């Protein structure tokens, strides 16, 4: 009976491929052919935040466009005031192995995680003037890769045991589990409407989930290796993903197929982080060649190079109002560009 | 600059001072990454998802990390600055020796471990000696080249042993040393060792190997090489 089921699966995959091919009449390159290019952009560093004594792994911008949080291998979580380069809070971590960090939309909680398979939630605003551990969520089998706050009481996490989970902070237990991937889950990206999210894993595929229903809606496979970073278009009907094949790709949701690819012959290293601009015209990517690249999303041509780091670029973020870009790397320094 | 901004700057300066003190205090320990495939007794090498071990010798502190399913390449990038990687393999059996050799190939030629040295432990020597004296299993069944292998005439065997045990252990050590010197040039070296189930002294060997590694680094950075 296994052979019949395998044959049915193959036939269904062929039917899906034919259905996708039937919907491709024109390419994004041709439709955007007669569009004025953005020219050449040049960004200069404005603030250099120093004080970390180890490699920086992740960062997250605040909702007020002024405060940010950074995590490093030394075991410290540091809250930075971007305007004056002052340190607001320094939090020591129980485990020195950290892979992600998050900032609450309300601005009174932070999240951390790593190789301890535990998501730690810290409370910022409280009496007696100190930061205390508010919650320790456990239940994952592998290491956590990313975490994004949904509200003050719900969070979403992705782990290395090929799964994602939605956690209620007050109760401390999982309410929904997403299990569709076959490889390590590396990145997740939420949506502006807080109803859907995309996940990218090591099986060279991406999945679109439903927060309420809890079932996978669409899957996308167009990469030749594992994908490291995933983003989400401000419109909410597309996303972008970068892999260690020295290639980025833009994927649609309604057409359910790939749109455009960003790659060049001179780049052979992997891609660590991706992000979008306010209008979606600019796609910022971090590479292992100690450099950051800026791509035109509608034309697939480089328009700028950020070169200020002497080690591997790890984390990249764009401000909510689109006024600055924060990049952190393995040289214990994170910089702001404008 | 208002008074509140001045107070914030003072608080930031105090935070910086505490961070610098903590970083200075945390730099005096050596870090080692212990890993082994299976059935090698890596948990009993030093008698004294992350497992941590303390041990101190000659007023020097060592912190050993044991992480514990198939592809470890994703989480091995973090351990790109440790002092050494301790690889333990059980030489008593021969069915899964090729798996250990392939694992050593994968670890030695890692992209992120091009400047990290490996200390090799060949455990369960008593079982190997008992098996080779019994005469039941033969190496030639698994490795054909054992039939035509040069004897260790030049090298000096340990005082008191059968020549067959010496030949077998030298063949295994040569198999690991050749694959070690296959790539990596002089960027990183391997240090082979022979260990039994109950060995009183094992931290001294790690201490000596770390001393040699730090000596090589010092020679490199003192503008001498």
């Amino acid at each position, epitope marked *: 009976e296994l052979d019949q089921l395998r044959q049915e699966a193959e036939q269904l995959k062929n039917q899906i491929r034919d259905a996708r091919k039937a919907c491709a009449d024109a390419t994004l390159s041709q439709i955007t052919n007669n569009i004025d290019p953005v020219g050449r952009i040049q960004m200069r560093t404005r603030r250099t935040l120093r004080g970390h004594l180890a490699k920086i792994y992740a960062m997250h911008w605040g909702t007020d466009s002024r*405060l940010l949080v950074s995590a490093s291998q030394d075991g410290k979580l540091i809250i930075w005031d971007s305007y004056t380069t002052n340190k607001v809070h320094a939090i020591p971590l129980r485990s020195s192995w950290v892979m992600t960090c998050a900032y609450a939309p309300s601005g009174n909680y932070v999240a951390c995680g790593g190789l301890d398979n535990i998501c730690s939630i810290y409370n910022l605003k409280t009496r*007696e*003037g100190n930061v205390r551990v508010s919650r320790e969520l456990a239940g994952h089998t592998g290491y956590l890769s990313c975490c994004r706050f949904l509200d003050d009481n719900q969070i979403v996490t992705s782990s290395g045991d090929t799964t994602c989970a939605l956690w209620d902070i007050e109760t401390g237990q999982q309410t929904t589990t997403f299990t569709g991937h076959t490889g390590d889950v590396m990145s997740l990206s939420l949506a502006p409407d807080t109803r859907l999210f995309v996940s990218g894993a090591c099986d060279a595929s991406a999945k679109l989930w439903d927060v309420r229903e809890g079932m996978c809606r669409q899957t996308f496979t167009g990469h030749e290796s594992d994908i490291n970073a995933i983003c989400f278009f401000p419109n909410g009907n597309a996303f972008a993903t970068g892999s260690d094949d020295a290639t980025c790709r833009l994927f649609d949701l309604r057409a359910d197929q790939e749109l455009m690819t960003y790659s060049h012959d001179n780049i052979i290293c992997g891609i660590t982080s991706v992000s979008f601009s306010k209008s979606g015209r600019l796609l910022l990517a971090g590479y292992d060649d100690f450099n950051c690249n800026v791509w035109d999303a509608l034309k697939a041509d480089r328009a700028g190079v950020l070169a200020g780091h002497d080690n591997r670029v790890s984390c990249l973020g764009v401000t909510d109002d689109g006024m600055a870009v924060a990049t952190g790397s393995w040289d214990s320094f994170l910089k702001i560009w404008n | 600059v*208002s008074a509140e901004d*001045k*107070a914030a700057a*003072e608080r930031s300066k105090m935070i910086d001072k505490n961070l610098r003190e903590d970083g200075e205090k945390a730099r005096r320990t050596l870090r080692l990454l212990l890993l082994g495939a299976d059935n090698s007794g890596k948990s009993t090498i030093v008698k004294q998802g992350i497992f941590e071990t303390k041990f101190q010798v000659d007023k020097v502190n060592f912190h050993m990390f044991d992480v514990g399913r198939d592809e470890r390449r994703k989480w091995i990038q973090c351990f790109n600055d440790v002092t050494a990687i301790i690889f333990v393999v059980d030489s008593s059996d021969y069915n899964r020796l090729q798996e250990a050799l392939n694992d050593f190939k994968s670890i030695w030629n890692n992209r992120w471990l091009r400047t990290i040295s490996v200390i090799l432990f060949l455990n369960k020597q008593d079982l190997l000696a008992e098996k080779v004296l019994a005469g039941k299993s033969k190496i030639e069944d698994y490795f054909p080249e054992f039939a035509r292998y040069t004897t260790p005439e030049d090298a000096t065997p340990e005082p008191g042993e059968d020549p067959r045990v010496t030949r077998a252990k030298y063949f295994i050590r040569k198999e690991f040393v050749d694959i070690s010197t296959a790539s990596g040039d002089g960027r990183h070296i391997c240090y082979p060792h022979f260990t039994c189930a109950v060995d009183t002294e094992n931290a001294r060997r790690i201490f000596n190997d770390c001393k040699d590694i730090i000596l090589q680094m010092n020679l490199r950075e003192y503008n001498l090489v």
Partner: single-chain antibody
Amino acid sequence: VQLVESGGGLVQPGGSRKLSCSASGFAFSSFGMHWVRQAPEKGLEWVAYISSGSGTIYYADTVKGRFTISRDDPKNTLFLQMTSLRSEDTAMYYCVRSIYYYGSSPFDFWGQGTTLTVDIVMTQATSSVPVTPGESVSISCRSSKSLLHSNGNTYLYWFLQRPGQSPQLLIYRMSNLASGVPDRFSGSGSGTAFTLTISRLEAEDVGVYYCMQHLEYPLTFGAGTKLEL
């Protein structure tokens, strides 16, 4: 969070005294401290200030040269040493905590105080206003110079003192509402003209209201506005 003040009594002029403020319930080493005093039948006058880490000390011109500040962090205590006492030093002394970072709310907690017996001008035109429950009330405070800084922060603070109680913070930086305060309190205004508004007034809101400035030292208070039924 508790602050207890000790030291007081009848003192002959020219004597010396030592007042203590003991803290229990919060991280004392992370908070700067202030000593404030209130005359028997007058308003609030700033006296002295000690910083965290003892790196910055400020004194008032009236008590300069004869008042000393100290703090002990392991023992969690603040000391005020008084020498050459005069007849104008009879008052009630309050020990206040304050913390300074982006988004903090200084002057959040006040102590009970202890009794002792022997440049910018803030004006509150009104003195006493009759009020009734369920009626909106607006009180105004004026300043000699502009309290608005180039960074966009207007430094004005509001305090309420009930009969037989220590003052508590109501509004900081002229717009932000402190924790534990009902939403019926609001504050607004511009340079040298600020207004505090209370809607749906009810009991336990009677007392004396004070407006304070934090732009530059020394800190100065207002005369005070009294609300009576």
